[PDB]
Amino acid sequence: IVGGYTCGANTVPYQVSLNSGYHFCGGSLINSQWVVSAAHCYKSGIQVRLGEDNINVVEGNEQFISASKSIVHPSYNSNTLNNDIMLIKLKSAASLNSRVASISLPTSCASAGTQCLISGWGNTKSSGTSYPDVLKCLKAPILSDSSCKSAYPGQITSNMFCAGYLEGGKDSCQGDSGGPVVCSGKLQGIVSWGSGCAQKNKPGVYTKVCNYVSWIKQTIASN
Numbered sequence: 197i198v199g200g201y202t203c204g205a206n207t208v209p210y211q212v213s214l215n216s217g218y219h220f221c222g223g224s225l226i227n228s229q230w231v232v233s234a235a236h237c238y239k240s241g242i243q244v245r246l247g248e249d250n251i252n253v254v255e256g257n258e259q260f261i262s263a264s265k266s267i268v269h270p271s272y273n274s275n276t277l278n279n280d281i282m283l284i285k286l287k288s289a290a291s292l293n294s295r296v297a298s299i300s301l302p303t304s305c306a307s308a309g310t311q312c313l314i315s316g317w318g319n320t321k322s323s324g325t326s327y328p329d330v331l332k333c334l335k336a337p338i339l340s341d342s343s344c345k346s347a348y349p350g351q352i353t354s355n356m357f358c359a360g361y362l363e364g365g366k367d368s369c370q371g372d373s374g375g376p377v378v379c380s381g382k383l384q385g386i387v388s389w390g391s392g393c394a395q396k397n398k399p400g401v402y403t404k405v406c407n408y409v410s411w412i413k414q415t416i417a418s419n
């Protein structure tokens with residue numbers, strides 16, 4: 197997260213870290229057994245880490261649970277990043293409490309102009325590299341579809357939305373991939389892509405979760 201703020205320990209209790217010997221992506225806990233992340237975050241041997249603030253220090257509130265299965269969206273296209281969403285099933289149910297909590301799936305799509313909370317342990321620099329220990333947060337508005345399409349001509353599908361600041365300086369980044377974009381207390385987006393980070397006229401592009409609720413519900417009802 198570039199140009200954001202320190203969230204505060206466990207103030208984003210649905211935030212997960214995906215670990216494969218090291219943090220490599222974020223995710224969102226949607227119930228005691230399931231995490232939503234980006235399909236581009238797929239790999240084998242994922243351990244889900246819940247209740248994290250400092251990802252490099254065991255602080256006492258964590259739950260580390262291995263993934264038992266990963267389900268990439270059936271229409272995910274890794275070239276265009278259309279349908280950039282994946283479900284991850286935990287080997288055992290998370291114990292839900294104040295520091296580890298699920299986030300609601302939306303019943304309707306969020307509106308342009310709506311403020312959302314984006315979070316992660318990704319790069320905090322728009323140029324160069326610096327990775328934080330503690331969870332970072334960013335408040336950012338959903339952009340109009342026309343401004344989103346104008347920023348990325350020929351690349352924005354109906355399964356994507358833009359959020360952030362056209363002036364640059366504030367954005368998600370590499371390492372935040374798969375993490376939550378929460379608007380009005382519902383999981384509305386997943387950190388997906390963008391040209392660099394916090395670049396002028398290049399806002400963040402996010403997987404449009406409201407399009408996937410039916411697939412999510414059906415998949416979790418059968419796996």
Ligand SMILES: CC(C)(O/N=C/c1ccc(C(=N)N)cc1)C(=O)O
Pocket residue numbers: 236367368369370371372373387388389390391392393394398399400401
């Ligand atoms: C695989 C892929 C496309 O992952 N992309 C991550 C990403 C996340 C957020 C942003 C952003 N909001 N500017 C930009 C890029 C990559 O590393 O090239």
Ligand SMILES: [Ca+2]
Pocket residue numbers: 248249250251252253254255256258
């Ligand atoms: Ca920790």
